[PDB]
Amino acid sequence: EVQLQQSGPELVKPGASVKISCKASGYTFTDYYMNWVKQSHGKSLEWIGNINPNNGGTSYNQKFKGKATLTVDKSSTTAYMELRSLTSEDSAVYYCTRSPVRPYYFDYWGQGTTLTVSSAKTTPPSVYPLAPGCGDTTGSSVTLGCLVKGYFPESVTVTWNSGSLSSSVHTFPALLQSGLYTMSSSVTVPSSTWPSQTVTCSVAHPASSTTVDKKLEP
Amino acid sequence: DIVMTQSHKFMSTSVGDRVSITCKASQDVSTAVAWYQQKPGQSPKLLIYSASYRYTGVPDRFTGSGSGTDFTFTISSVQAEDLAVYYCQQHYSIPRTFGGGTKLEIKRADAAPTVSIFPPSSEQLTSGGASVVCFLNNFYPKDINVKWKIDGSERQNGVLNSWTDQDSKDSTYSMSSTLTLTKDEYERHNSYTCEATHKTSTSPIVKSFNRNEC
Amino acid sequence: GSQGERETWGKKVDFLLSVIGYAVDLGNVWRFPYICAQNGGGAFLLPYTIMAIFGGIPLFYMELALGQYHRNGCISIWRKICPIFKGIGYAICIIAFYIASYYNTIMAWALYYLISSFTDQLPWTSCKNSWNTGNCTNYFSEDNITWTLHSTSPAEEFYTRHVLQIHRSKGLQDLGGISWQLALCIMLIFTVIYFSIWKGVKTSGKVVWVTATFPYIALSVLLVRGATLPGAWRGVLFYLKPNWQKLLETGVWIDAAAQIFFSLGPGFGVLLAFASYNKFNNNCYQDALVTSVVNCMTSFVSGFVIFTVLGYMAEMRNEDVSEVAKDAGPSLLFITYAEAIANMPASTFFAIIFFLMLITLGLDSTFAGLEGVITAVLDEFPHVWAKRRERFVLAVVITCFFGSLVTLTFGGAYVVKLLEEYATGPAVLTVALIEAVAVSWFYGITQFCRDVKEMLGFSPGWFWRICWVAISPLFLLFIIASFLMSPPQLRLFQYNYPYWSIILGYAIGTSSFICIPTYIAYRLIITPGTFKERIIKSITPETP
Ligand SMILES: Brc1ccc([C@@H]2CCNC[C@H]2COc2ccc3c(c2)OCO3)cc1
Ligand SMILES: *[C@@H]1O[C@H](CO)[C@@H](O)[C@H](O)[C@H]1NC(C)=O
């Protein structure tokens, strides 16, 4: 149906510029205002501005005037937002959301765009299999894990066997220290399919465009 | 401009209880308030528009009320998947502003933390590092003590506690206590032990393993 | 012998309500409330009065005093003051023409609405008409509606595709042809001014009894009506909320000065003509004072008349009245206000008195507008003219119809803006400056204080003296410089005017101005002597 597919995460050095796209689909693109909402880590939603796709009618917020520049293209039904003078405060998630003209609600949003403004080098993650020992008592279920150590920025994805299954996967948030992140993942799966079948965790780092897959071994 | 104030940053409720989040605006708004539901890790989802009207695709358990400045979002039958952070937003005056955000935490019965200790893998011992892990899964509430024991002594340097958010299925928190050490220090000690003190029981749960090729 | 002394007015109240009739128009109704609520709200009253006291009032009273004292036209009075500036009298004659091309077409719209408002079900209520598109979405229809960028309201559809038919023109480039309905409307207008001007000051002065008093009645009905509407305090809040920070902007003062000037309209020759037909013994200080204070307060209450209905309209919709009051111009009254009064009981009544009120507002002002020019030409070419008044009056009226034929087109509205912004404002400001400077500096403000001292019996205060010598020509100079420095890009109905419009505008702004430096060249070029000799005999008026 109505889909707003935004662009991927961006790691940009402070002081530079960055442009974010927003592919709209599933409705008459010229029939709705295209908005941009900023969401800082742990903060509330912040309205950047809107744009009329017909003529590029940008209506900004006084707080973002000269900070963001909204553009639009009808030939591909895609709205863009460009940001200059990047600081540490701009390291936030940005959404592009559709809205009618009245009443002005935000019915459909995008998945978000993680922006990290830091001069820290893109560090690839170290994937180390967190496997149970060989002396443990195998009960009705075994808990497994995979450790992701030392990466930047927070763009990372830990999957388990192409997403099948994952009805008991506990993913622990990443922690930042000395400019590098570190997280861990776990999965509770019964003992009647291990170690008979194959269980493998896949760690993907989009900012460094790397993907290391490690299989758990007791 | 308009200042939307949500005085209560957190609200505790249970599955099936009647919950209601408040929203205070700067001036008179008539009936121009929209309520959004942002689930952890998802985009904000529109639920209510113009104070009381529900948006399409929203279950009957979500309602809205208020007329003037103060507005209220009501859920009659809270489900495990209704766990989210709710925002209120005005839609009359330029610019459009939002509320501070009210996280709805679900209250349930106590649960015993399942503690599992993990020895450093061979790929990490190969790299020259060794991290002993201690997972604490499915417990309630969030308040829980985690104590480390390298060889019986409470280890405190290099310990990181990571609490996940509440669950959307059984409403059970889960945390990870990580004890990261070097390889040289790992091959000079054997049986690692991590214990957890929770309110479910007075005696902390003690877990141990051996370094000598398990 | 023969004519000799000029005629005299029929009563004091006729000329009081007559100059009030010129002063009060459409802009008083909607322009001032918009510019007021936009520039700092109620705080706008603080500079507006200053720009009144220091700027509008002195020009108003000076013009009026000269008019009643010298009893001459807009062209013949310069013969007896500063002959080289006689071209001023000509310039106004051109300026007025440009104004009469669009000012009455607006009254034609209000007239087309008025005759279209006699039906039991008003046309701009339903969408099942012969002019509505598929975008037309209206009320008394399913609730929950969520408006679309392409959707359009039945009032906007009616004003756009019917009375204007502006969708049938692409802009200034292609605007033809002519809408005969508005041609018949404006023809009826030129008729109703024809039977109110053709005889002279007696008929204009008698029609003014109705054309200047009824707007207060219609504004009173819509005032007490708009006040009883639920949630009307929003428009009043947005209308009078003080935002003193906007007063720090150097623009706002400029807006206030331009507003009070173009709402008192001094130095246009209309006040000269209206003042000419009065008693020499008759006081005029109180006249000018009260008349202005009426135009200003009338604007102040008109603000409520508009923003109460706009407040109710913002309550039925969703607040922040500014959004429902974004567009200033013909759309604030013909669309928003009409659509607002459509949802009220006995809507035929409020509609009839509303658009009838619009025509009633324009009528008196255009009476006076023509009155000044007619007096000027009759006094400048006597005996060669005055053979009949209906001849010259008929000529100028049919001339105004042919002038409005460019405005009766589909894109006529476009032209209306081009003529409303570019042509009148800079030139009128200029001629007011040159006129004020010529009366205060050339003729000498001392001899002017002697003329008023012979007029009312007492010399005008040192306040009026310093206002005429310095404060008023600086008041006009301010708006002149600020205007020339930042001419405005203008847009109407989702259509930005071409970059070249200003060029066209400047033509229409200067094609009327060319007469005064060329007349100075004609005077100084026609009488031989030296440059210092001929300009000294050309700056001093007739001795006898
Ligand atoms: Br800029 C400028 C300067 C002064 C004015 C006055 C002042 C306010 N009250 C009416 C208005 C009179 O506007 C006219 C209308 C029809 C006319 C006319 C003049 O002369 C020929 O027919 C408007 C614009
Ligand atoms: C409605 O208006 C849009 C432009 O505003 C136009 O493209 C569309 O064709 C219109 N609808 C109909 C049915 O004409």
Author numbering:
A (entry chain B): 20 to 237
B (entry chain C): 21 to 234
C (entry chain A): 74 to 617
Task: Give sentences from the paper.
5-HT is cleared from synapses and taken into presynaptic neurons by the serotonin transporter (SERT), thus terminating serotonergic signaling. SERT resides in the plasma membrane of neurons and belongs to a family of neurotransmitter sodium symporters (NSSs) which also includes the dopamine (DAT) and norepinephrine transporters (NET). NSSs are twelve transmembrane spanning secondary active transporters which utilize sodium and chloride gradients to energize the transport of neurotransmitter across the membrane. SSRIs are competitive inhibitors that bind with high-affinity and specificity to a central substrate-binding site in SERT, preventing 5-HT binding and arresting SERT in an outward-open conformation.
To resolve the ambiguity of paroxetine binding poses at the central binding site, we turned to paroxetine derivatives whereby the 4-fluoro group is substituted with either a bromine or an iodine group. The ts2-inactive variant (Tyr110Ala, Ile291Ala), by contrast, is unable to transport 5-HT but can be crystallized due to the stabilizing Tyr110Ala mutation and binds SSRIs with high-affinity. We then explored the binding pose of paroxetine by growing crystals and collecting x-ray data of the ts2-inactive SERT-8B6 Fab complex with Br- and I-paroxetine. If Br- and I-paroxetine were to bind in both the ABC or ACB poses, we expected to observe two anomalous peaks in our x-ray maps in subsites B and C; for both ligands, however, only a single detectable peak was observed in subsite C. No detectable anomalous peaks were observed in either subsite B or in the allosteric site and there were no other peaks in any other location above 2.5σ, suggesting that under these conditions, Br-paroxetine and I-paroxetine do not bind substantially in the ACB orientation or to the allosteric site. The Fo(paroxetine)-Fo(Br-paroxetine) map also revealed a difference peak in subsite C near the halogenated groups while no significant peaks were detected in subsite B. For example, the ts2-inactive (Tyr110Ala, Ile291Ala) variant employed in the previous and present x-ray studies exhibited a Ki of 0.17 ± 0.02 nM for paroxetine, 0.94 ± 0.01 nM for Br-paroxetine, and a further decrease in affinity to I-paroxetine (2.3 ± 0.1 nM). The larger atomic radius, the longer length of the carbon-halogen bond, and the difference in electronegativity of bromine (radius: 1.85 Å, bond-length: 1.92 Å, electronegativity: 2.96) and iodine (radius: 1.98 Å, bond-length: 2.14 Å, electronegativity: 2.66) relative to fluorine (radius: 1.47 Å, bond-length: 1.35 Å, electronegativity: 3.98) would explain why the fluorine analogue binds with greater affinity than Br-paroxetine and I-paroxetine. Thus, our direct biophysical observations reveal that under the conditions that we tested the ABC pose of paroxetine is preferred over the the ACB pose.
